[PDB]
Subunit: 115 residues, 4 copies
């Protein structure tokens, strides 16, 4: 699994469950083409977005739909979504974990890159 | 000053100086049109982006060029840029402060909305 | 002002007001002796904790009563308090700003050390 | 496993490996008694600190030795250590995961509490 996302909720002290996210890849004409999408499980994890063959070099954007997550819980948050934009596989294949911690007016994201 | 941005460097424990950013407003056709831009000062702050008359309700995107910042320090970063995407909503007098804390593989952002 | 603390609320997107904290200095027998204390202002800031003459090199602990803050908002928090423990070291003129961003089950803290 | 700790490094984009930590529990005389200790594995995780029987109600402090971690990597950080202080098992047994993200001048911690 070369691209996985883990999301935690800092208000409830729990995984962030049912968070939708869309992944895009920058096309040669510099537009964002849809690449993969999914939602976090009961563990706050989203696996199986892509494969080693399909996950070629490029610039990728992970849009985490944090607004829909908070609204579904009856909370009005600040951000529309959280964005994680990065060049992937520039030096050969890597495995990426994107971790996110969500509050209504704040979020943090970090990346774990392994070879 | 209805919109200010402050950027901090978590590696050096200092304001992030000379960090360029652009602010976009979402248009009716869902494109991002330029709205304002600048570079952070020696205090890591960027003031004077817009005025109350101009800063109407809408969806705004702040795109922070974190990659050039790390590159100029000789450090290889993960992210192409940091994005902060939010709705401005009229609810009493509201000043927006967007803060971003930068590390090579991570960033945190929070909003302080005051009266 | 060689030592200032700023506290933000990530649930409400606001300064954390009336947050009490104590600062301790480590003594030669490894106990923590009281050094300074106060409560954050309406801007979430606590100034005037110490002076340059008094703020000598040493290990300092800032103990922030985050639990009382959340309790007064009707929210059950995880942490008993937030601690920031650091060494003050003379390297040019150095002002210390300690920032803490509070959520019920999380906190982030950073230091900005300027000249 | 009722108490586990996961630590990530925001500078290297990796688990934080070989981070030492000491856990203390507040005794009836209000002193901190040593409870458990360990170091994070290659995955940045520390398991096996305690057992369900031994992990009774109380106030616990997890001291994460972030200074030794950064120094061992030749970096001079701000904090002496990161502290996580919390009441555990007040409403019956729970499982706690403490997650931490480390930068030289900043850290974030969050808690995941499951039943
Ligand atoms: C893939 S299993 C897993 N490892 C984790 C490591 C950490 Cl640090 C974590 O918390 C965070 C995740 C993102 C930003 C911050 Cl600021 C924090 Cl604190 C959750 C984690 N979940
Ligand atoms: C209301 S104006 C304001 N000044 C600030 C100074 C600091 Cl250092 C601050 O910290 C942070 C900024 C971003 C992420 C994190 Cl994780 C933290 Cl901790 C927030 C601030 N907001």
């Amino acid at each position: 699994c070369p691209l996985m996302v883990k999301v935690l909720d800092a208000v409830r002290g729990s995984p962030a469950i049912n968070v939708a996210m869309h992944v895009f890849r920058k096309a040669a004409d510099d537009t964002w083409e849809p690449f993969a999408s999914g939602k976090t499980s009961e563990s706050g994890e989203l696996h199986g977005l892509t494969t080693e063959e399909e996950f070629v070099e490029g610039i990728y954007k992970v849009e985490i739909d944090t607004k829909s997550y908070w609204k579904a819980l009856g909370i009005s948050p600040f951000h529309e979504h959280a964005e994680v934009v990065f060049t992937a596989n520039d030096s050969g294949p890597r495995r990426y974990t994107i971790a996110a911690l969500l509050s209504p007016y704040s979020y943090s994201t970090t990346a774990v890159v392994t070879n």
